[PDB]
Symmetry: C3
Subunit: 251 residues, 3 copies
Amino acid sequence: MGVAVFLVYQTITDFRDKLKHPVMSVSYKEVNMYDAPGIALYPGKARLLSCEHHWYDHIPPLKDPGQPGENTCVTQDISYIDPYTNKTMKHALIVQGPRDVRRRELVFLQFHLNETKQDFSAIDYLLFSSYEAFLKSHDQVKFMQDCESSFSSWKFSGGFRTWVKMSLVKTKEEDGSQSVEFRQETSVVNFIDRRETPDKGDQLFFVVFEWKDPYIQEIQDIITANPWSMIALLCSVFLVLFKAADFAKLS
Amino acid sequence: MGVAVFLVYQTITDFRDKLKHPVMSVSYKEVNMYDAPGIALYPGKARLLSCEHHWYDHIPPLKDPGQPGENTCVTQDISYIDPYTNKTMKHALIVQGPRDVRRRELVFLQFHLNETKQDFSAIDYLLFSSYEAFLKSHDQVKFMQDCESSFSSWKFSGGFRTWVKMSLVKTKEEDGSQSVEFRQETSVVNFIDRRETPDKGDQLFFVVFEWKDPYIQEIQDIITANPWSMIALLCSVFLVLFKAADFAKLS
Amino acid sequence: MGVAVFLVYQTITDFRDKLKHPVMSVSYKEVNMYDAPGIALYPGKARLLSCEHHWYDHIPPLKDPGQPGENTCVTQDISYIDPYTNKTMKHALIVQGPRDVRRRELVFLQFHLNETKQDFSAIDYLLFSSYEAFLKSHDQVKFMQDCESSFSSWKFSGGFRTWVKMSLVKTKEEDGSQSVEFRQETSVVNFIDRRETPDKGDQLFFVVFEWKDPYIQEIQDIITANPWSMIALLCSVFLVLFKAADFAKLS
């Protein structure tokens, strides 16, 4: 009897320990064509020059800095308002990201910034999951607000390329909903300004966005214990101790 | 009987496999106000100019390059000794970290040094868990030594800002103790020299420390199996096979 | 009877849910001496100047750039062919990595590149597991193609140092094989050109490779459920329900 009560006490405490915190598992999934995200860039003073997509070409052809044109980009720019303060004005320009990963597709963005007083020049940017959901559905102006309140924005360095290789992670929370977040790693490459005339000193920006790997990481949180197993086990131990008592009575 | 012995062999092998290596789980938690950490710096010859804390103001006001002043930073500088070799004398400068996470308080630092024969510009730094533990408690001079031998130090570049976003990860080892480590990612933004445009070419540094997200990740290693469940299951299989043998005898 | 059928329904559904996706666990391991790995380089037109190993010296001695010599490096330079397109010929350079981890040996490389038409100067590089596997075993010319179609190559910026701290992550899949992949984070330090100050403006590169920590992270995917436990549990529940039926008959 004392053995039974100690066993049931330890079992119930173990079940409490198991239920108070779950376990986490990871998984991967391959996509034939990535859903094209949207990269949000705050031009601010800066003016775009050329947004180009390189679907399969290994090398970007040699360019001529300082001139606009060659805009083959799906762009949508509307002035907005920051919901974090609601009294400040934020302005953005939205583009469509790289689609196919099998053939490396990189979007190449040239940015020229006019002369400014600020010592450290950089342009902020932000990424959200998909572009078509922001383009067509209703009430997406507030979608930008909640996306920026949820997603995080990190500015890229102003002066040289920041080759951005992004990735997608889908965590499956158990309350009937899904969460998507973007993980990216950047690679800065110094640029030679000798070809351009740097006597003016006006900063020129360059950004390249790419898909790191076709696979997307899926993370699931698993509950490790169920009441049915414990109740069956304790019933079995009760039965076996009853059988032992019956044997002792037979003795 | 043979079924019983094979089942017990398989179960004991499974239990040994479960016991030899555990399974990890992750957890998060919110904090109202982060504990003020400490940032350890090794300026060398680079005497600093201005350490300022920006509780909510988004942007540091433009800083005149070179001229000192505006020290609103809790700092202390004491010459130390390296425990790794014990014959090399190294000096460190210690500051307190940012605290306000909801207002994302950031610390702004600056450095200046006359040109030397180092051929490069970089200042090493190191982070430990808290400042009040280094200040008030007894025998913290050796706390520097064992924290340095435990923590890892990475130098920041010299000539442009290195925006550091740090987060604290707490892993709960099972032997009645706890471990704290810092995970950080840096962001470098180029700095324009044309403002001062001097002929001396003296290096100027800029560092910004910040908290990434309020969430603290907790990692615990959980053992997947316990002997009580396995012993109860083997007792149950013994009982059911005994009942089958009794039924066969009745037959 | 209905209780039994619903319980087995829930049990079989839970077992299917456990079977479809397993759980993942992580582990660490110390090594007395890391195996010497191999670093792949694609200099192209940039003939290197000096490859040096700093077995224990914390500090690299002051150098005089612009002139070749002092090649104390285990190098193997060959011309290859890209299997991705199979009509492109690319040249590679192969060196051995650092070995000593307790003394944290670091490898120093200097590259000089003549002025090029490309507006952004960078040298791509790739990492594979070991050097003696490429050098001594048979048909490793195709091992280069295998590794470059398997491993990922990331270019380093040209003009300033890119201090690379690599680490080895060894995951072991369940179908009788293991996977080794390298995770690295770079640390760029600005390089001062005031020492030479030429009017040619030719590029100079510097790379330093070093092990991050002696620990090797090992990842195993663990199956969480096995048929023996659930079949024994359902047999036990069937037996106890049969006992309940016998008791009801007795009543």
